[PDB]
Amino acid sequence: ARTKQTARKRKQLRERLVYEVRQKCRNIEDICISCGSLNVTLEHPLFVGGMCQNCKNCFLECAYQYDDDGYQSYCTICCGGREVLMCGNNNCCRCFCVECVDLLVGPGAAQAAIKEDPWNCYMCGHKGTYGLLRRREDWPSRLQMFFA
Ligand SMILES: [Zn+2]
Ligand SMILES: [Zn+2]
Ligand SMILES: [Zn+2]
């Protein structure tokens, strides 16, 4: 995977909650997979998990933020990130930051993606499930509803 630093524009909590999900003491549907808030008011449209209103608002904005490389400015999951992996295919243009990858796919996963070439992101890959990341069967209709 190609990487970039994001254009300049919580962790403790996300980290603890992901541990609890992995340990089967919390459901991923009951946390905001983007920031870790427990004030879940909707379902994340791409991946199994919850989303808070504030994150929904960021997602709506970030969807339209692209860099001059033709790729999305920010992480698909958390709408931020410092360093992001870029999907190897051109109809995609998505990015995933190393924090969410190591956190949700697993420790080592980012570095493994960085050294996989060509690399297809978690939205493009045929398997659909990577660690805690579980792509929705119906993300296109969810995504459409989400933006309408
Ligand atoms: Zn959130
Ligand atoms: Zn992220
Ligand atoms: Zn992709």
Curated annotation (Swiss-Prot):
A zinc finger (PHD-type) spans 72-128. A zinc finger (GATA-type) spans 31-61. Highly expressed in fetal tissues, skeletal muscle, heart, peripheral blood mononuclear cells, kidney, and at lower levels in placenta, brain, liver, colon, spleen, small intestine and lung. Changing residue 70 to S: In TBRS; somatic mutation. It is found in: Nucleus; Chromosome; Cytoplasm. Residues 32-124 are annotated as: Interaction with the PRC2/EED-EZH2 complex. Residues 20-148 form the ADD domain. Sumoylated; sumoylation disrupts the ability to interact with histone deacetylases (HDAC1 and HDAC2) and repress transcription. Inactivation by auto-methylation may be used to inactivate unused DNA methyltransferases in the cell. Required for genome-wide de novo methylation and is essential for the establishment of DNA methylation patterns during development. DNA methylation is coordinated with methylation of histones. It modifies DNA in a non-processive manner and also methylates non-CpG sites. May preferentially methylate DNA linker between 2 nucleosomal cores and is inhibited by histone H1. Plays a role in paternal and maternal imprinting. Required for methylation of most imprinted loci in germ cells. Acts as a transcriptional corepressor for ZBTB18. Belongs to the class I-like SAM-binding methyltransferase superfamily. C5-methyltransferase family. The PWWP domain is essential for targeting to pericentric heterochromatin. It specifically recognizes and binds trimethylated 'Lys-36' of histone H3 (H3K36me3). Heterotetramer composed of 1 DNMT3A homodimer and 2 DNMT3L subunits (DNMT3L-DNMT3A-DNMT3A-DNMT3L). Interacts with UBC9, PIAS1 and PIAS2. Binds the ZBTB18 transcriptional repressor. Interacts with SETDB1. Associates with HDAC1 through its ADD domain. Interacts with UHRF1. Interacts with DNMT1 and DNMT3B. Interacts with the PRC2/EED-EZH2 complex. Interacts with MPHOSPH8. Interacts with histone H3 that is not methylated at 'Lys-4' (H3K4). Interacts with SPOCD1. It is linked to Tatton-Brown-Rahman syndrome: An overgrowth syndrome characterized by a distinctive facial appearance, tall stature and intellectual disability. Facial gestalt is characterized by a round face, heavy horizontal eyebrows and narrow palpebral fissures. Less common features include atrial septal defects, seizures, umbilical hernia, and scoliosis. Leukemia, acute myelogenous: A subtype of acute leukemia, a cancer of the white blood cells. AML is a malignant disease of bone marrow characterized by maturational arrest of hematopoietic precursors at an early stage of development. Clonal expansion of myeloid blasts occurs in bone marrow, blood, and other tissue. Myelogenous leukemias develop from changes in cells that normally produce neutrophils, basophils, eosinophils and monocytes. This is DNA (cytosine-5)-methyltransferase 3A. It comes from Homo sapiens. The gene is DNMT3A.
